[PDB]
Design a protein around this ligand. Structure first.
Ligand SMILES: O=C(O)CCC(=O)C(=O)O
Ligand SMILES: [Fe+3]
Ligand SMILES: [Zn+2]
Lengths: 17, 450
């Protein structure tokens, strides 16, 4: 089969810098 | 084209035009005590916590009640078990929980400085213990992933003692039907804190419920507002130049009061479990030295379903990724879970009918143009797919492209694939569900008996 790529999903707090 | 029918809404009707007296602007937080495992595992507790009129609930001494060894989450035990895996930190100004000062130190503001850096568990622990010994700016270790099943086995085994609707994994949990990992939502994250450590204002990703247990020896202070008021809070955020959905803000409490918005305020002590109901806007600050653990659950109520789909479509308006793939989830739930609530049934079935339609239309147009479609069926443990360019969920019909390597493919939605090659040349088109596969799953999905 074809290997289909995905971005990993992750909760992360907001960041300003 | 919407996956929702407004006629089906179950949101509670709330005036906001009615001016509220002071005591209704500072409502008390439902605070429950569990005398027995039996009481913890009752469906009555599930009904209470997910009631749409109940935005947030604190379950006092739950840890003791079910014989959870919270000591397995002490900073000491966690360090002994950790690897050198990188974890993330936020650096913030230490200030009282009801304050957020501008750079001058003369007024309250909404934007809240919280900058990213990295460390290890062991190195944040030394900072935390040295702070506690007194040996202004502070560091907060946040979103620490306890997803490694082997490394964290004793910790994770303790959480199997919770009632099922609170557990990380459950057949009644929508997030257990994604079929892939969403770190921090259907896996556990850890929060290592010093006093002043802040998690700023938010709704959860895709408005899912949240479970949070306070470990470490100190308390946390919580602030919450009912889902109903989120657009008004979002407008203060615009007013003050900070993004509601992805930015870092801390409400000015008197703004919300002036806006006629009730604000729940309460203290979570060691062993207290906080249940955050669907769509509740909340923010949190440590009062003492402590650790918290938290994750998301998606209980099978119509209110949860509605708010998750609404936020899914609002994300798409705002060009923000929904990290919960609600179409994929919706078909999976219909395939494997009996649904007896008529409201929730109606909404899922409406969603699936719009999705079956969308797929049929676009399959039709591809055959009309002679475009090869190949079948790459679903296989156990396969993730759900999203477009590489615009981050929308791409369900079933996939537009994939190659050559990084010639053997790996990126996924796109139709719109973005056609922008890159309007004849779809060099785009391979896959389908993971045959047309009759979807027709049969939809027909098989019928309201179960109560
Ligand atoms: O412990 C915290 O800082 C809060 C994390 C959070 O917002 C949640 O548990 O939903
Ligand atoms: Fe939260
Ligand atoms: Zn796209």
């Amino acid at each position: 089969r074809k290997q289909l790529m995905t971005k990993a999903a992750r909760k992360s707090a907001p960041a300003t810098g | 084209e919407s996956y929702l029918s407004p006629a089906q809404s179950v949101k509670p009707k709330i005036n906001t035009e009615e001016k509220l007296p002071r005591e209704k602007l500072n409502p008390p937080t439902p605070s429950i005590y569990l005398e027995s495992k039996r009481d913890a595992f009752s469906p009555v507790l599930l009904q209470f916590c997910t009631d749409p009129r109940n935005p947030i609930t604190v379950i006092r001494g739950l840890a003791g009640s079910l014989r959870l060894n919270l000591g397995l989450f002490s900073t000491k035990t966690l360090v002994e078990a950790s690897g050198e895996h990188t974890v993330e930190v936020r650096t913030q100004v230490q200030q009282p929980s009801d304050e957020n000062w501008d750079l001058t130190g003369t007024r309250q503001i909404w934007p809240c400085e919280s900058s990213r850096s990295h460390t290890t568990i062991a190195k944040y622990a030394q900072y935390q213990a040295s702070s506690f010994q007194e040996s202004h700016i502070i560091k907060f270790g946040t979103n620490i992933d306890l997803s490694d099943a082997k490394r964290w086995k004793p910790q994770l085994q303790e959480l199997l003692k919770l009632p099922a609707f609170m557990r990380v994994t459950s057949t009644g949990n929508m997030l257990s039907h994604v079929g892939h990992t969403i770190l921090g939502m259907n896996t556990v994250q850890l929060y290592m804190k010093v006093p002043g450590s802040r998690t700023p204002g938010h709704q959860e990703n895709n408005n899912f419920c949240s479970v949070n247990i306070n470990i470490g020896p100190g308390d946390c202070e919580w602030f919450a507002v009912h889902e109903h008021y989120w657009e008004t809070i979002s407008a203060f955020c615009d007013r003050h130049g900070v993004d509601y959905l992805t930015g870092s803000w801390w409400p000015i409490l008197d703004d919300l009061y002036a806006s006629n918005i009730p604000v729940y305020r309460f203290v979570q002590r060691p062993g207290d479990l906080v249940w955050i109901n669907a769509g509740t806007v909340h923010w949190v600050q440590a009062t003492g030295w402590c650790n918290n653990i938290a994750w998301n659950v998606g209980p099978l109520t119509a209110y949860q379903y509605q708010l998750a789909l609404e936020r899914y479509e609002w994300n798409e308006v705002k060009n923000v990724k929904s990290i919960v793939p609600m179409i994929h989830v919706s078909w999976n739930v219909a395939r494997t879970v009996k649904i007896s609530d008529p409201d929730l049934f109606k909404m899922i079935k409406f969603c699936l009918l719009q999705s079956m339609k969308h797929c049929q239309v676009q399959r039709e147009s591809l055959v009309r143009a002679g475009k090869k479609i190949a079948y790459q069926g679903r296989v156990k443990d396969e993730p759900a797919y999203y477009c590489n360019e615009c981050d929308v969920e791409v369900f079933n019909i996939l537009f994939v492209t190659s050559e990084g390597s010639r053997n790996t493919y990126l996924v796109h939605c139709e719109g973005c694939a056609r922008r890159r090659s309007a004849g779809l040349q060099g785009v391979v088109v896959l389908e993971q569900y045959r047309t009759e596969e979807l027709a049969q799953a939809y027909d098989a999905f019928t309201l179960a008996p109560a």
